[PDB]
């Protein structure tokens, strides 16, 4: 109807770029490894990718893969909230789209107060929810070239699958050979590496999902499959060198349910470390501050007194007695419930 | 219904005919512009008005006579100091909602930098944000401290040195023109050094003899020119005027009685009446 | 913030009421008659706008400022212990 405000945003599917004629540089120019866009030697300047370092200082991270359909300011606030978990954030900037300044091109810069805070922040990628297009933001430290671990989630999923397979293998070995000593049983268990699934000695999934074999045995539901019995790393080895693993006699259905439960619990553990809360180890916030935080995402309902005027005269009697009395009764009920909550 | 943060709750689900036939004069009080979905005004886009802007309301009486009137926003002219822009910004038109939003954000610079476009509702604010980011990119231009509107346009951004040069050139032209006009209208006139004696009437009897003129300004031509320019700087008087920057300033309304020219029903200016008299807006 | 309910209309202008003229602020320095450092005080918006913020005695109580103060105090305590 009218010119669009920032509430109306549009974006379009990007066709993958194919150089159909490799020698035709005029119509199929090379992409730049820095900007990931077509080289334009006539009207562009070379970029080393470190330019923002001269602007934001050494303690700076570049964030990539930011989604569409969001204001640069909204994304700046969200990124500030996320990166506050690692220290004091001096600044957050989000580059606008070439064709829509209200949207982002997909790049941002975060300037930290402390080198240690920035280095801690760079370690893991940032997984976003569906409302942010499920994007996984990739982080790059400008002062050390350190990058985020974009394969962390899928490597951990593979580790969880390997742990379930290890549990099944050990249960089968116990069912076949009977009770076995720990240091001999553990050497019969193998995992498949990520991503090509090459057989390996099972020692990495255990330490990435549980921290140790004792943790694996003592954490549910594997303690419902196995029972450790007495006849640092040195303590672990010595303690395992004098044990026997005994099985809990289960049926096929119970064992299958237990394996599914173990998978689900490990999945929850994986999601927790990616969705750690942003208020962890921070002071409480006043009600006004919490309302200001909320307003970045949601607007409060408009006052009902203003809203009443929308009742059209064609079918409604504006300011009607029964309608207003209904409003008063609802208000009274809400106040009574609040009083009950207080008491 | 949905969109409970916006006006029209009981219109959202009544039908198409009612929506098209809605009569604006049904709404007595003004609705906030953001919740109504109203286009920002040019004045709002040239100032920082946040939630406030031109609106309308209806007058209804016991006789059931209806009347709709335009109502202007409550705007003040205030000066700000911006560290990000490295300059004082005189006479920005601001509102109470805008001032409260600046308080919430943490000041003028924070309000300009952090506010989303929908809430800011100010193209002038967006341009200020652009200039702040440009100054961040190019600190050396910030050290000049020129008025921020020098770099409002993108071309000035692409050619900063010409922007500063042209700004200074136009400023000097303005200064020279004003100086010449003031000299022309000055109350002190210095005649030529070869004929300083003006025509006089016969001195009244008993008046003491006037001493010979002291022409100290004839020793050097440079001194003569400096003295002549200094004399040209003089002014007859200085006038007082309404200025909101002064604590005791005020403006004027209409006459005490409240009457009007007999037999004349004056029509107020509109966009279809006296629309472009003496200036665009 | 302003409220849009029952505004005053006069002279063709609209003036909106301010039911809540108060805002919370964090005290960065000792202000005689207001509080000590690190306190969250409800002050008047004019007081914040024209005295406290210009003089650098307080700042709006945003989560950013609160967290920055907390982390700075923790760092200062750790610095004391390192010096000892």
């Amino acid at each position: 109807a009218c010119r669009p405000g920032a509430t109306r945003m549009k974006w379009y599917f990007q066709k993958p770029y194919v150089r159909r004629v490799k020698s035709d540089f005029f119509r199929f120019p090379l992409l730049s490894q820095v900007t990931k866009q077509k080289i334009d030697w006539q009207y562009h300047h070379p970029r080393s990718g470190y330019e923002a370092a001269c602007i934001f200082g050494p303690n700076t991270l570049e964030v990539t893969n930011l989604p569409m359909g969001k204001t640069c300011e909204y994304l700046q606030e969200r990124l500030w909230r996320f990166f506050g978990k690692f220290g004091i954030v001096e600044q957050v900037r989000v580059l606008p789209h070439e064709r829509d300044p209200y949207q982002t091109c997909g790049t941002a810069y975060v300037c930290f107060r402390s080198r240690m805070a920035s280095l801690r922040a760079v370690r893991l990628p940032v997984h976003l929810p569906a409302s942010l297009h499920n994007r996984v933001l990739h982080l790059r430290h400008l002062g050390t070239d350190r990058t985020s671990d974009d394969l962390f989630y899928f490597r951990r999923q593979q580790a969880i699958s390997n742990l379930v397979a290890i549990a099944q293998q050990l249960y089968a070995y116990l069912e076949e050979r009977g009770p076995l000593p720990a240091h001999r049983a553990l050497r019969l268990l193998f995992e498949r590496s990520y991503p090509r699934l090459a057989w390996r000695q099972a020692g990495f999934s255990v330490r990435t999902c549980c921290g140790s074999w004792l943790g694996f045995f003592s954490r549910s539901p594997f303690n419902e499959l196995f029972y450790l019995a007495r006849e640092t790393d040195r303590e672990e080895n010595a303690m395992l060198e004098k044990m026997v693993i005994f099985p809990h006699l289960l049926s096929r259905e119970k064992l299958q349910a237990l394996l599914l439960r173990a998978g689900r619990l490990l999945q929850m553990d994986l999601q927790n470390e990616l969705s750690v809360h942003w208020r962890t180890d921070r002071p409480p916030l006043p009600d006004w501050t919490q309302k200001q935080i909320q307003l970045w995402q949601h607007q409060d309902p408009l006052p009902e007194e203003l809203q009443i005027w929308s009742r059209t005269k064609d079918y409604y009697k504006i300011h009607e007695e029964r309608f207003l009395f209904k409003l008063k009764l609802k208000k009274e009920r809400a106040q009574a419930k609040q009083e009950m909550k207080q008491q | 219904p949905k969109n409970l943060n916006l006006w029209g709750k009981y219109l959202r689900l009544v039908g198409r005919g009612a929506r098209r036939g809605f009569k604006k004069w049904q709404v007595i009080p003004p609705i906030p512009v953001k919740a109504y979905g109203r286009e920002p005004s040019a004045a709002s886009q040239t100032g920082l008005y946040h939630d406030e802007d031109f609106n309308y309301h209806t007058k209804r009486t016991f006789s059931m006579r209806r009347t709709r009137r335009k109502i202007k926003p409550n705007v003040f002219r205030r000066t700000f100091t911006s560290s990000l822009l490295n300059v004082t910004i005189p006479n920005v038109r601001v509102t109470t909602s805008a001032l409260h939003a600046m308080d919430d954000m943490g000041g003028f610079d924070a309000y300009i930098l952090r506010t989303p476009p929908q809430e800011l509702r100010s193209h002038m604010g967006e341009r200020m944000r652009q200039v702040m980011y440009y100054y961040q990119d190019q600190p050396a231009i910030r050290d000049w401290g020129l008025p921020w509107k020098v770099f409002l346009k993108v071309a000035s951004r692409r050619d900063p040195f010409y922007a500063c040069y042209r700004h200074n050139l136009r400023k000097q032209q303005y200064e020279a023109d004003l100086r010449s006009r003031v000299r022309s209208f000055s109350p002190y006139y210095l005649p030529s050094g070869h004929q300083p004696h003006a025509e006089r009437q016969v001195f009244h009897e008993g008046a003491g003899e006037s001493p010979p003129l002291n022409l100290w300004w004839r020793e050097n031509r440079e001194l003569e020119e400096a003295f002549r320019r200094r004399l040209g700087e003089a002014k007859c008087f200085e006038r007082a005027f309404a200025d909101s920057s002064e604590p005791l300033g005020y403006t004027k309304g209409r006459c005490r009685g409240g009457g009007g020219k007999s037999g004349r029903s004056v029509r107020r200016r509109s966009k279809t009446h006296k629309y472009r008299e003496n200036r665009a807006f | 913030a302003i409220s849009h309910l029952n505004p005053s209309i006069s002279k063709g202008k609209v003036h909106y009421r301010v039911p809540n003229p108060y805002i919370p602020v964090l005290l960065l320095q000792a202000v005689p008659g207001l509080g000590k450092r690190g306190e969250l005080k409800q002050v008047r918006r004019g007081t914040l706008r024209l005295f406290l913020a210009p003089k650098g005695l307080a700042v709006v109580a945003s989560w950013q400022n609160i967290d920055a103060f907390y982390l700075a105090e923790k760092e200062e305590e750790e610095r004391r212990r390192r010096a000892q």
């Binding site: - | 004027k252 309304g253 005490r256 | 009421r17 003229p21 919370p24 409800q42």
Partner: peptide
């Protein structure tokens, strides 16, 4: 309004100058 001062002297009994400082945390 023949005389229209920019600053109007504040009223003593207006609710604006007498409103309560409110509370930081509602729960306590």
């Amino acid at each position: 309004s023949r005389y229209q001062p920019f600053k109007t002297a504040s009223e003593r009994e207006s609710p604006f100058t007498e409103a309560e400082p409110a509370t930081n945390f509602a729960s306590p």
